[PDB]
């Protein structure tokens, strides 16, 4: 009754659409050659995510910041060593079911 509607509403609140820290696979994020390793392979950024209460509505970003991160890229064969690369990743700052 009371307490159950309370908790249920809390579950809704807790499960609502919003930006969340996720691990993005860099290679898969820019779609590079199948001969590259990234180190680290993934980066933690915030992206819009969660569940909408309709199906035809999908959680999308309405505003995005950009984060500079630096990591290393190994190519094959080992012609050269790991080179430093600077990359900008999306950091979603607001979301809406659209």
């Amino acid at each position: 009754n009371t307490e159950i509607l309370k908790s249920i509403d809390n579950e809704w609140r807790k499960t609502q659409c919003m930006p969340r820290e996720v691990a993005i696979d860099v290679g898969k994020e820019f779609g590079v050659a199948t001969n590259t390793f990234f180190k680290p392979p993934c980066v933690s950024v915030y992206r819009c995510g969660g569940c909408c209460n309709s199906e035809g509505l999908q959680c999308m970003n309405t505003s995005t910041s950009y984060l500079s991160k630096t990591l290393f890229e190994i190519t094959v064969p080992l012609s050269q060593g790991p080179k430093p690369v600077t990359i900008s990743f999306a950091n979603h700052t607001s979301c809406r079911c659209m």
Binding site: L5, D9, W12, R13, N53, S54
Partner: protein, 172 residues
């Protein structure tokens, strides 16, 4: 052709636990349409006076008896509000759906004709001012569909010691 009641008003203010008895009398054999049952004696007493009469009476009247009362043989309608203190609010409960037609009405029925009352949910509170969203004592509040789509459930909030009805919401 149209019949008439013993009380020519479209809105009666009654208190709970008060005995209510009205005579609908007009021409043809008549029959009341008072919502439900029971504990209320239904006796069709003729009177002549220039018409056939029919009286409706009820001794024990509380909240679960407030509603509309029609005496159809050109029908004759009259609404009656029965004021209760324990349960001023009547829920569905848990019955609410909607179709995209810009018209989404909430069925949260009010015991008292004049109240300052607001509808609240998970998505803040929704104040009625009359242009986009409008309150109506007859049954509840009226809201446009695509704006309330954002909310998942709804619950009417009052100003008294507070009382909260609780229907839900499913969009189409």
């Amino acid at each position: 052709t149209p019949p008439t009641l013993n009380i020519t008003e479209e809105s009666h203010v009654i208190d709970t636990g008060d005995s209510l008895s009205i005579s609908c009398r007009g021409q043809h054999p008549l029959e009341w349409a008072w919502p439900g049952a029971q504990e209320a004696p239904a006796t069709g007493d003729k009177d002549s006076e220039r018409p056939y009469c029919k009286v409706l009476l009820l001794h024990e009247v509380h909240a679960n008896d407030t509603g509309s009362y029609v005496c159809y043989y050109t029908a004759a309608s009259s609404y009656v509000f029965v004021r209760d203190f324990e349960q001023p609010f009547i829920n569905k409960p848990d019955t609410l759906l909607v179709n995209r037609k810009d018209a989404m009405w909430v069925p949260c029925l009010v015991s008292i004709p004049g109240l300052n009352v607001t509808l609240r949910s998970q998505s803040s509170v929704l104040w009625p001012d009359g242009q986009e969203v409008v309150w109506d004592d007859r049954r509840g509040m009226l809201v446009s569909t695509p704006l309330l789509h954002d909310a998942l459930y709804l619950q009417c909030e009052t100003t008294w010691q507070d009382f909260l009805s609780n229907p839900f919401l499913v969009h189409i």
